[PDB]
């Protein structure tokens, strides 16, 4: 997951 600003759970 490349998004560091959202919890991917």
């Amino acid at each position: 997951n490349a998004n560091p600003n959202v919890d991917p759970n």
């Epitope: 997951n1 490349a2 998004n3 560091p4 600003n5 959202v6 919890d7 991917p8 759970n9």
Partner: antibody, heavy 122, light 109 residues
Framework: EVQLVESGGGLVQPGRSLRLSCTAS????????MSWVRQAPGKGLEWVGF??????????ENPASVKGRFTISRDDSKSIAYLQMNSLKTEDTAVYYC?????????????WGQGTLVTVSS | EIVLTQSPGTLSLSPGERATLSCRAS???????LAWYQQKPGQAPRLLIY???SRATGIPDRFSGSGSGTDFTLTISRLEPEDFAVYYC?????????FGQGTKVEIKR
């Protein structure tokens, strides 16, 4: 004003381990994701991982070049991000920068420390 | 991984001239996930431009960016002496985050 100071670098023999520290001040450290970027001498920039904020799970991501060898953690009570570097190889010789990941939908690397040099050699 | 290819490798210009730097992505990437950085020898990189229209705080007006999909451009409308340095593009929309190989802006003679 944002300040990021890297420490823990220096000379280390191949196969040994190092832990880098990045001490942050001037902003709410716990609100931001943090990221490490390295630059081998004479070469370009390579991302080596980020860690999310506690509000976003606090988990990490890193590329395959360092996966299983490097681990990022953070201490929000001390405003410090860490880079645990295990199984070091000569190819890991680089200047290591800690960066603050910007908020919002466009998470660029808004602030960079001066960097700390890590030299892997026997 | 998305490969970022910058061109030209070195652009040779005089102070006061216009600089046009290119960054081509091997796969389509939205403009929201693209950034440009400046680095001078012996110093850390600094953020210049990110996203569609975002400019980093304290960055002068002469730096601008455009493009979408696979083709992106960084424009320095009027080169100042401190603008001669290495410029990197970066994408962070896909894992892993990747940087271009860098474009050097040198003094022409």
């Amino acid at each position: 004003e944002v300040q990021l100071v890297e420490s823990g670098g220096g000379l280390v023999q191949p196969g040994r381990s190092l832990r880098l520290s990045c001490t942050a001040s001037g902003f709410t450290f716990g609100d931001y994701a943090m990221s490490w970027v390295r630059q081998a001498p004479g070469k370009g920039l390579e991302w080596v991982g980020f860690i999310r904020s506690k509000a976003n799970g606090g988990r990490t991501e890193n590329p395959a070049s360092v996966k299983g060898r490097f681990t990022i953690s953070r201490d929000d009570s001390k405003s410090i991000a860490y880079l645990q570097m295990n199984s070091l190889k000569t190819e890991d010789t680089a200047v290591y920068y800690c960066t603050r990941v910007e908020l919002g939908s466009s998470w660029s690397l808004g602030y960079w420390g001066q960097g700390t040099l890590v030299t892997v050699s026997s | 991984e998305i490969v970022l290819t910058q061109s030209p490798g070195t652009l040779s210009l005089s102070p006061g001239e216009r600089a046009t730097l290119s960054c081509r992505a091997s796969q389509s990437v939205s403009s929201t996930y693209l950034a440009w950085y400046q680095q001078k020898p012996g110093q850390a990189p600094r953020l210049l431009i990110y996203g569609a229209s975002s400019r980093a705080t304290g960055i002068p007006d002469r730096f601008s960016g455009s493009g979408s999909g696979t083709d992106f451009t960084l424009t320095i409308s009027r080169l100042e002496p401190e603008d001669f340095a290495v410029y990197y593009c970066q994408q962070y929309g896909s894992s892993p985050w990747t940087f271009g190989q860098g474009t050097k802006v040198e003094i022409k003679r």
